[PDB]
Amino acid sequence: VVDPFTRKEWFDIKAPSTFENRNVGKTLVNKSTGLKSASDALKGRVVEVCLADLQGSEDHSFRKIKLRVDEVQGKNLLTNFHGMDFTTDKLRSMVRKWQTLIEANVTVKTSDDYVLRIFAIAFTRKQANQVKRHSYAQSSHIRAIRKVISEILTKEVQGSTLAQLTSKLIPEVINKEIENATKDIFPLQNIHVRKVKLLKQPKFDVGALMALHG
Amino acid sequence: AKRTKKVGITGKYGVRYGSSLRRQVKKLEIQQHARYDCSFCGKKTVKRGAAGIWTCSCCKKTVAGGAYTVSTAAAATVRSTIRRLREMVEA
Amino acid sequence: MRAKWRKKRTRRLKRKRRKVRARSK
Amino acid sequence: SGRGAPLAKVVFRDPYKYRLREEIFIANEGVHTGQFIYAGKKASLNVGNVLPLGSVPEGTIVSNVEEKPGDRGALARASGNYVIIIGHNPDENKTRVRLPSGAKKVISSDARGVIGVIAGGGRVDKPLLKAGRAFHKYRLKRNSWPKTRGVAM
Amino acid sequence: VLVQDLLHPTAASEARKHKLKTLVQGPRSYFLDVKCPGCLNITTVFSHAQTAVTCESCSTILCTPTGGKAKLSEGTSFRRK
Amino acid sequence: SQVFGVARIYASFNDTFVHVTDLSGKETIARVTGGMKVKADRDESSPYAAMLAAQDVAAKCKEVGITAVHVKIRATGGTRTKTPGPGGQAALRALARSGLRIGRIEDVTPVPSDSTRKKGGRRGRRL
Amino acid sequence: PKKRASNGRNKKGRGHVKPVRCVNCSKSIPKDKAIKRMAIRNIVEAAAVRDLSEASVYPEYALPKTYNKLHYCVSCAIHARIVRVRSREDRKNRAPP
Amino acid sequence: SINQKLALVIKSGKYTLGYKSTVKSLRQGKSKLIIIAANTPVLRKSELEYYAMLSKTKVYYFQGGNNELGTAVGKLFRVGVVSILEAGDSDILTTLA
RNA sequence: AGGUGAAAUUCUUGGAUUUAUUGAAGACUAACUACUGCGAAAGCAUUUGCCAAGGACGUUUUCAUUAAUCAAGAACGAAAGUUAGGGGAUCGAAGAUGAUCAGAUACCGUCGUAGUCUUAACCAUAAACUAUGCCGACUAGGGAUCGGGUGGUGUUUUUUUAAUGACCCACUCGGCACCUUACGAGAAAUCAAAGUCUUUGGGUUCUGGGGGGAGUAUGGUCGCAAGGCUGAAACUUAAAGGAAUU
Lengths: 214, 91, 25, 153, 81, 127, 97, 97
What we know:
Chain E: Belongs to the eukaryotic ribosomal protein eS27 family. Chain E: Its cofactor is Zn(2+). By secondary structure, chain A is an alpha+beta fold. Chain A has helices at 88-91, 142-156, 161-169, 175-181, 206-209, and strands at residues 46-50, 64-68, 81-85, 108-109, 115-116, 121-123, 189-192, 196-197. Chain A has one domain (6-214). In chain B, the strands form two sheets. A two-stranded antiparallel sheet of chain B has the order 1-2. In chain B, strands 3-4 form a two-stranded antiparallel sheet. The longest helix of chain B has 16 residues, at 74-89. Chains in contact: A-B, A-F, A-G, B-D, B-H, F-G.
């Protein structure tokens, strides 16, 4: 027995400058020991949370922005965008029945030559005339959704890295870009980009390390 | 006059040793002897020039493949993986 | 008696009749 | 002639003297007498080439690698055998790798790792047939054959 | 059922069903006489056509292959028959 | 401005994992399972088990001082019953019945592609 | 003897399609020829629902849901689940209740 | 489609199969096409690449084979370089590539 | 902790169960997944390039009897089982056993080799099912449902009357199942086929005959074997089988 409460430093964590409120939540690393200071302790930790409590509108009480602690600044762990995800709980909530699920994937590189991969989820709905209880597609139309989802995604990216790409992810401007070309074809309900993952990032760069401090 | 029903280039091993043994023999024997396609020309005219090599008569460049087959079941799933890493670090 | 149990009882005594049959090869 | 795979005289006109010393990079089931190879921590991940594991990835297969960065190649030198990687670490360079002894050992991310396995698709999977290819077999190894029985003498 | 007269037909069942189930085979389609703005000669064409029918000197493709009737451009005149 | 974190409590069959962690996840806070109060095992994922479960974690979270927690409960997920603990939700009935600000209620039970064979087969586990 | 149209369950002119094992006694059987029911479970239950909203942080919150899909084995699904053995022409029944 | 273009112009077009003839057609001034696939030595084609800029001719590097580029020329024999001389039917001078 | 109805096994001071950061082989393609698809059958559900194919209908298209279904024969053939290269992620014949009862080989527990899938090739079999043959015309209505043709300054859209896509409307051939009775038929069950069979014949592939014995003896042909198609007879016995009813 040692009651670790002592070496259980009730630390804290916040957000960068790409969002709104630089407040995410408190944590608990470990008291500064011998050859294990309170700077290079973990740093590989992460911050998984819905961007609703991360911003200020309960409309986004869905979708979970994925972050990963970089290092400590002001005895307050910073953070950075490692990717975007969709709540597993809201995934089964948007699935009704008698329909068709249209999904797609695509690997893309940014200007900073960052390796990530934006996807896109899609559910089906009827029309203001149709009587059909299904609203399926001739497949050759759902197959056209994949060549158009990747078209859109890989046509705007490859610039300003995910710093400006994530600056359009949160305000869900893609929900009106997907429903933009689809307006001249099929209606579709929900319509979101769902997931995207990043894993090809160099090492600790002090450059964008102070671009998170503001 | 094919002097075989189920022996082929193994009948040269008569009744000695055993059937089971000689059976598998003919397998990779054929997948070594046969003028293997040289991907360094796309023209198949390269046989087995000693254990693990394929002497090519199409630019005369000897080839590094398999002990019998030009690519075993093992070094096959491996042909894939090295390709995978290549791109991730490429661009 | 199940038909699969009766079908195998005789399948074993049929492969067994190939044994006492090997006494004539 | 005496092993079981195409070992090549890998030429180097010497990075400090003008004399071509054909060094030696073992067998690779996927090469040819005429490849523009590159060796050194700053080369491409093309088979035949090589760089220390501080320039390679998690789950790679290569040969004639040093357990001690310089041995010129210890592990990964067999007809039909390879070496994959089971882990890594940027600091301390402790990249865990897959060796067929049923276990795995840790190396440093500075050891020379030459891309590709040793050539020889399925040898112990194509019988001697007769002690003939078996006598001419121990011919380029050692007179440990024939092996008698203990209960005997 | 009971009694009718498949000897004397009606105009309703003449513009609804397939000529292959009525009493005699006959095309429900037709041809057309469509011209282009600048042709002072003649131009006789088909209906669905399938293959795209071109022009004379200013070949600007009159129509293209459609599942329906070979669609015409903004420089043509849909002339029925 | 609150003392954030993530509950990430679990509740399978024959046990109920009643403990909380931090938003990072690479650091937990308390464990305390329900069978630790009951010495019979007959009733493991039972009702009073979860009550006494969030009882041993109730005063321990009062020691850290964390209250605002983004809970991420689970059933069993993976490839088993895929059904939440029968009396394991009685843990929420006792932690709220004592005090603990809850918000951002969600789940993270991963559903498979029926990939790895399930434990049953054709004829299944008929008793 | 034979009492049902597509005997199994919507099994007509195809054969082996794509099966899904039972999510109860682990009894495997085809998805398009078995039985399945959607699960609309909220987040908690019907009793302690009020006590959780009282402690809920943020203005009453939005409160999302967690749905699911069921798969039954037939044998156990009849033990005392959804069925209760039905009548003749009431067998053709394809209506919700 | 790259299939339609090839089929037609090769069943009614003036061509030249081979290094010498490609060099002869090059040192004539009536060759505008020379497609070599990835498997044939681009070294012989290196002089053809050093001659691509010298011949000023618009080359094309087909991602395939000269045994699949053999179906393109006509006989199941071996031909790495397809050098077009005079137009005979189609004009791949401007295609979807 | 894993676990059952509760146990015991087992993993646990050698820190497993526990949440988080990259991984990996092997496996899968979930939820939408349907009285629906397309494919010769068997079946086969993520994306894209390539290869080409089949198809509904479009057509005032070309042929001119091309034709129509099969003994011996000829291609694929799920899955078990196979010879061997890659292959055990889980589950998991067998096995190992902890409970159970008088007993348990088994059901329920944990682990666990063959197996699990692949490369080119074997065994060619199943409730391979629609227990119900292929095609050419007819006897009924509505449509559930898809591919398709038409007209609509029809619904939705705004960029800009054009180009417009999708939805709506009767109709609607080739498809996929259902409903009402049955004109008919059927032992009944039930069936738009089991109608068009005493009022029995439109061309045709195949097999069955009271049941045991017994798909077993023999042999031929196939295959490595297990075993496949195969196919007795004596003797015995007056019941057996099916529908449907009480």
